[model samples]
Target: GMNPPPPETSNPNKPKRQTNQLQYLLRVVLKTLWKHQFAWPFQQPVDAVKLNLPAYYKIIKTPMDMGTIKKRLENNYYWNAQECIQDFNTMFTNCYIYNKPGDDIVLMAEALEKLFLQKINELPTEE
Candidate 1:
């Protein structure tokens, strides 16, 4: 039950955003997952639904059909998850900073947001 973010100001001098533990956690997970070796199934010859998980991350195939299996094998996980995490942390951190939620509270909030997104994905979308 998160509220929508406010309209971004066009002003040149917005407040400096603080980095949350979320930023570091996600980047490290991505770096580790991508560096790990993976083998595609030889017999299936279709999309794979698998997890070498941070358990929060999602895997996806490359954007286009490349006409050959070798090229089609190219895939990547979402890097935009980092962008979403940072934007959220910056927004919430600045919101709560003056109210002083402190490091422990904010860090817990960062971790829980990962679960929140995962659960949201499991729900069906509107037709």
Candidate 2:
């Protein structure tokens, strides 16, 4: 199936980044979801998943999804989370399908990940 984004018309809103309201709304709504509200099964604890989403957004940083999700969670849902997630997964399997991050970016990612792992390992207990 061929999918094309709606043609941009006059005075179309094109925000280069998410607004504070959008981020705040996500933080609030996700915190609400974290409360086990809406629809789900409570198995283990789940974090806001906010930062994870936006970080992955940075990786893709495409014009389409950036607007959809950054604008409203409903917009993101409209695009279908399943498909968006699949697209993100492919970015990994396809050898940085979006475009390989530069050496500095990879180095930063690796160093931060290592530090994060070491910090987690140093946890008093895995509780």
Candidate 3:
């Protein structure tokens, strides 16, 4: 007679499930922001050499971008929406600091900032 087969190996539940409601909701908002047309300028880190702006790094001590924020979210670096909001502000502020007041990039940043604030405000209030 053949020996009894071993128990079937079933996969265990994933441990990476998001436990925080705010984080999950904020991530959704971020995804929308990434897809916004005005998102291009703030998508990646500023390359001073590539853009021929040597003082970029000096002016923006803490450079923030959509890609960086996305990575931070994936890594669970933010404890709350406020923290993420602060980063977004930082990103917009840096753009304003580096570009002229009426520049296209600055205008885009302003538009994106308004969109971000509106989206965050529309989130369901926490219990």
Candidate 4:
């Protein structure tokens, strides 16, 4: 003998349904970056030992990567869009610090960074 609330008043706890327009746009942009050619180097955490760059870990204390960011987004770890953007910035900043100005990886990071900015800017402001 329970009475159901109206559709408008119902409060659902579905996590998957919580994605708003902004989140969807952010995910799209992130996926585009993932598919970019320059994404390889930033796909995962840098292996300092394998790369024989012993000082890499020392220079970059807070390392970030596309895989980690993707995982965070999937897991709803980001509190806001700005937090997600900050992670991308951190990833690019780490790349810039670890590699020299003209290094191939640095160039790739620059390209990806520019693309990210452009795509993010294209998202709707109101959403």
**For this target, which candidate reaches the highest TM-score against the unseen true structure?**
4
Write one digit per residue (lDDT tens) for candidate 4, span 7-111.
121223423333453375456878999999889888877766667777776777778888877766766666567767888899999888888898988999999
- Where is the poorest 10-residue window by lDDT in model 3? 1-10
* TM-score per candidate, chains pooled: 0.23, 0.24, 0.78, 0.79
lDDT of 2 by residue, 1-127 (tens): 1223422322225323333333433454333332332112111211115323334333433323222332344343322333333432332232233335664434433443343334333322211
Write down the lDDT that model 3 would get. Answer: 0.72
Candidate 1 lDDT over 34-96, as tens digits, reads 233321111122232242222111221121111121111212121234443444344334324
Which should have the higher TM-score, number 1 or number 2? 2
Error of 3 at 71 (Å): 0.6
Off by over 4 Å in 2: 1-102
Candidate 1's TM-score reads 0.23
Q: Report the error of model 4 at residue 121, Å.
A: 0.3
- Which candidate number has the best lDDT? 4
Residue 43 in candidate 3, Cα distance off native in Å? 1.0
Alpha-carbon shift of residue 38 in model 4 (angstroms): 1.2
